[PDB]
Amino acid sequence: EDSTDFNDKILNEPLKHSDFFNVKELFSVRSLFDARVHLGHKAGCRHRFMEPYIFGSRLDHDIIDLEQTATHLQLALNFTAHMAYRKGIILFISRNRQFSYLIENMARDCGEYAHTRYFRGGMLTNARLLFGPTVRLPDLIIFLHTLNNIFEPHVAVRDAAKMNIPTVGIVDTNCNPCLITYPVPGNDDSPLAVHLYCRLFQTAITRAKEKRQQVEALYRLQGQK
Amino acid sequence: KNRAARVRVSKGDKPVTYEEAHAPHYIAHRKGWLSLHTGNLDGEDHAAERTVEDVFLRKFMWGTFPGCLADQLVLKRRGNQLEICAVVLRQLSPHKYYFLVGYSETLLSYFYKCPVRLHLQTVPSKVVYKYL
């Protein structure tokens, strides 16, 4: 009797709005351009499945079309915010050691999880053995870098799909986005780009958790009276 | 490869007791002796006779309490007293354990011409030390 009203006012109401958390105010094509998000790798490193997202090559350096990044980033931030609102477990994954410390801190600050270390075989597909039969896996995996340190796709991209976990991922021009649920074409190398991504996801997640408490609190006060 | 008194590794499903899990080189190091008497001390006599008596009592008790013994017997000799300490299961009715204690103590006292006492410790199931 009271559960259907709960799930309808709290869980289903945010899903009826195009931008319930107003994540479009967090970034702009200019803000992305200043963070050097459009800068990709040289043409010789281009991955075939990234051609649709490439604006062009400027003297053999691929340029990422920020008009597409803006639309893909909007979807990724929106999805990420909704998953944080629903109290989903968000796991950040990246092997880029220059940003391991930054990413681990961003996860702790937003109240989420980070895995920036060597990824051991079976963390996801064999989690019950490694952690226990009652272990809860992540509801969303966010890749700030989709490649490992030998320039291959991070094993968790394949294993996240095997476990039917949606993935958000920054995909540079040398990355393979086929299995990434919400790919975001963008520069993954420059500290300005990576720092921006961490600010955006951190802000999206922090806002969505605060929104969940506001809605719940209002739903309770009105319930008593 | 040495075989003597070694329970060999299996698939991890074979329960062994503490007595069974220790090879002979652990005797006096990790496991004690199952019979204690003075016959094997320096300058003491009748070790052969104590050994025959011990072999009989172990066979005798195995068949007198069939399916009830959960571990090896502990044999203690003090003076002319003989104490038999056995760990048994809790399947047989207590009336049968009292019958067999009275029967065994009396029969063994007349056989070896010494006061024999039987001490029973009951356990719900065989105590498992490890699964080999």
Binding site: R128, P133, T134 | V55, F56, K59, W62, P66, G67, L92, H95, K96, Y98, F99, L100, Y103
Partner: protein, 343 residues
């Protein structure tokens, strides 16, 4: 001598000879192995050949409120006890010989087609009672090792399905066959395909594919046609829930390539709703049983095109000589269209 006697465990371990050089590499052509029998099973403590009645051990301690005294059964009364113990023993032997009858699969000695039951319930109280498991192949594979030489293992292929479109298959490997069965069936439920069925009885369209060297040609069929397909395809189709289909397997007939090809073909079929949405046209079904009545089976969810589909006077589609040879009455096979049991 009393002192030369051993325990039953020692006597059976020796007599059975389960461990030995003969068991190591199956060095002997042997069939019927001695089986250990527990000789203390029906034995009562206190009962002996002489028939003595010991109060408190084999007879009640108190009778009519008084302690019983030592007594001995009469010769006649003891003969009955011995006979009753033999009959009790014969019943134990008789029943053990008697067995329940295994339902056979594709042949009497084959594992293929035999059900393994539902997969085991998962650790988190997950259950698969709705799923049935079928064996497709049991193979003895061998590897050569430095020490042990020719080593024997079991490779098992099983398929699982709930009969409502959800089905999968997995390979199982182990030294023992029952362990291979457990691994295969439990793994398959984590690799399930969903197979779309037209009217929940057949496929949506003819499927012709090659997987490696195995060719599989499947034809959509009407109700009542049954499963006229390779026996393994019949087994898999019952797990999916397909009742009416024709299939012909050509080329290499490999069970794993046939199973993997089958699931690929069935997973990659276009439904009528998908066809309508892709082309923005109505999908109209014509049945000779229903005459010229046009039956719309699928309509596009989005806008409906106004331009008719181009009518190519002659289609440039590739034809199978087998289908053409049959439609022309030129395919003459004594083995085709034979009467068979309901499948």
């Amino acid at each position: 001598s009393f002192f030369t006697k051993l325990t039953a465990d020692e006597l059976w371990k020796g007599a059975l000879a389960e461990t030995g050089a003969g068991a190591k590499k199956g060095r002997g052509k042997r069939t019927k192995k001695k089986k250990r029998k527990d000789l203390n099973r029906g034995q009562i403590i206190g009962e002996g050949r002489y028939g003595f009645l010991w109060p408190g051990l084999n007879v009640p301690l108190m009778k009519n409120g008084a302690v019983q005294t030592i007594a001995q059964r009469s010769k006649e009364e003891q003969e009955k006890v011995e006979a009753d113990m033999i009959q009790q023993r014969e019943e134990w032997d008789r029943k053990k010989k008697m067995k329940v009858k295994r339902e056979r699969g594709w042949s009497g000695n084959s594992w293929g087609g035999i059900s393994l039951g539902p997969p085991d319930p998962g650790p988190c109280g997950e259950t698969y009672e709705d799923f049935d498991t079928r064996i497709l192949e049991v193979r003895n594979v061998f590897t050569m090792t430095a020490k042990e030489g020719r080593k024997k293992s079991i490779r098992v292929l099983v398929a699982v399905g709930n009969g409502k479109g959800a089905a999968g298959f997995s390979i199982g490997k182990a030294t023992d066959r029952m362990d291979a069965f457990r691994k295969a069936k439990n793994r398959a439920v984590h690799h399930l395909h969903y197979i779309e069925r037209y009217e929940d009885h057949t496929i949506f369209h003819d499927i012709s594919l090659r997987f490696k060297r195995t060719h599989i040609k499947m034809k959509k069929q009407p109700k009542g046609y049954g499963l006229r397909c390779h026996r393994a395809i019949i087994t898999i189709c019952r797990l999916i829930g397909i009742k009416d289909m024709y299939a012909k397997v050509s080329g290499s007939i490999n069970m794993l390539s046939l199973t993997q090809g089958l699931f690929r073909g069935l997973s990659r079929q276009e439904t009528h709703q998908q066809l309508a949405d892709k082309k923005g046209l109505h999908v109209v079904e014509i049945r000779e049983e229903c005459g010229p009545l046009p039956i719309v089976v699928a309509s596009p969810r989005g806008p409906l095109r106004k331009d008719p589909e181009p009518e190519d006077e002659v289609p440039d589609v590739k034809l199978d000589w087998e289908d053409v040879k049959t439609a022309q009455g030129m395919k003459r096979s004594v083995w085709s269209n034979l009467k068979r049991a309901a499948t």
